[PDB]
Design a protein around this ligand. Structure first.
Ligand SMILES: O=C(CC(F)(F)F)N1CCNCC1
Length: 435
């Protein structure tokens, strides 16, 4: 497994022990062979669980999610998938790791796809080994994989709005339920309906994940309402999963705007990971999985794969060479390697718009490639009338850094900057020059 030119997919079923049992064994062997090694966690929550499974082993934790006093003699580094890709893009030298281990390797965020592309290219080149740990590798067609204990799978209509009748089975349950919804806004409506019925609800999404996930351990709850982020190794002490089987798909239209299409079917990999939250305890058979739609290959033409290509085109590999996407996920985007390669100054602006600006990859690229500098926010106000961002059914407004009240009307419209109240609040701060 650990020899150069080898990429291994460790595809044991969800809950088979890849992280707590296999990962420590791989790490001890890597340390024995003096292999400079990187371990990639999808989230800060998974990073903290990894420190528990690897306690006593000399591992350098490159995350503030763990409070450890490093010895300085570690040859194994652990960081998030996003941190690995970010450090590659920044001028900082990243060691050329002999062994690259990615946990929850199915993660489809642009930075995780870019990390797989870079690592798999180094393996193809004969320069490194890699291990991708996931029950659901790219292109998997099985939404019902094995589990630690039998699961009751039931196809049923699942509410996507508040309801007054017709879904008694949802509230009649006396255990704990994890409910996957297509968006933060959809979860808000379902959570309000459940709270009005006397239920204790926790809501999870990308921006609130670490903070809110702690509540699943610190307090008694009846329902967790979550977006697709809980497919990335989040573990719950639950006996039921309710799965809408739906998600939002970012789509670039005519190369000039990004919309959030759908809700539409999830992939088989996503469905298998949502279901995989339960059936994990061999002593508790009969956990339930209620699903409300079919699966489809909705990663085809999904913006994240084009965004992954924008990131990889701006990462140095060797001379003018550019890393390809990991082969099983390379047909998801029709893109020419190198088409998004930016010159030195525009590349620095592109990195800063993502790192400090917190903009989506696609939007950061449109701004940097137009020759606009990081602090120049005139583009947030000079788009066409159809690009007006709305808040409470009225045009959103901000005070510019000049002290003028203007309507938010970006030159390039990316639906992700206003997908929920939290995102639009962050984008207003950016348009005003506050970061
Ligand atoms: O809340 C935000 C920041 C905003 F773009 F809106 F400024 N997000 C999360 C990161 N991706 C873009 C959307």
């Amino acid at each position: 497994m650990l020899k150069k030119k080898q990429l291994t997919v460790l595809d044991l079923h969800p809950g088979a022990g890849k992280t707590r049992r296999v990962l420590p064994e791989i790490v001890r062997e890597a340390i024995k062979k003096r292999l400079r090694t990187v371990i990639l966690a999808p989230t800060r929550v998974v990073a903290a669980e990894m420190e528990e499974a690897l306690r006593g082993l000399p591992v350098r934790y490159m995350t503030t999610a763990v409070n450890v006093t490093h010895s300085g003699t570690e040859i194994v580094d652990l960081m998030c998938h996003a941190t690995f890709t970010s450090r590659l893009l920044q001028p900082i030298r990243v060691p050329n790791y002999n062994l690259n281990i990615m946990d929850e390797a199915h993660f489809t965020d642009p930075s995780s796809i870019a990390a797989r592309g870079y690592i798999s290219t180094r393996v193809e080149m004969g320069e490194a080994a890699a291990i991708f740990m996931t029950a659901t590798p790219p292109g998997t067609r099985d939404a019902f994989p094995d589990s630690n204990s039998p699961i009751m799978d039931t196809e049923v209509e699942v509410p996507e709005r508040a309801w007054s009748s017709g879904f008694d089975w949802v509230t009649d349950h006396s255990g704990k339920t994890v409910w996957f919804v297509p968006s933060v806004r959809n979860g808000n409506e379902i959570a309000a309906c459940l709270t009005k019925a006397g239920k204790r609800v926790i809501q999870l999404s990308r921006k609130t994940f670490e903070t809110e996930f702690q509540k699943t351990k610190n307090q008694e709850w009846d329902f967790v309402i979550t977006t697709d982020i809980s497919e990335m190794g989040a573990n719950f002490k639950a006996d039921r999963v309710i799965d809408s089987r739906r998600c939002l798909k970012p789509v670039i239209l005519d190369g000039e705007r990004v919309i959030l299409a759908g809700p539409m079917p999830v992939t088989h990999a996503s469905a298998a990971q949502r279901r995989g939250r339960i059936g994990r305890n061999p002593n508790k058979p009969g956990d339930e999985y209620m699903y409300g739609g079919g699966c489809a290959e909705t990663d085809e033409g999904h913006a994240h794969w084009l965004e992954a290509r924008m990131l990889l085109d701006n990462i140095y590999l060797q001379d003018g060479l550019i890393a390809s996407l990991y082969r099983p996920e390379a047909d998801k985007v029709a893109a020419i390697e190198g088409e998004f390669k930016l010159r030195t100054e525009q590349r620095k602006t592109f990195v800063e718009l993502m790192k400090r600006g917190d903009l989506p990859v696609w939007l950061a690229y449109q701004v940097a490639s137009a020759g606009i500098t990081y602090t120049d926010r005139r583009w947030c106000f000079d788009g066409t009338t159809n690009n007006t961002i709305m808040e409470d059914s009225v045009p959103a407004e901000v005070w510019t850094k000049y002290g003028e009240k203007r309507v938010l009307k970006p030159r390039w419209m990316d639906a992700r900057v206003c997908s929920d109240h939290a995102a639009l609040k962050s984008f207003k701060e950016f348009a005003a020059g506050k970061r």
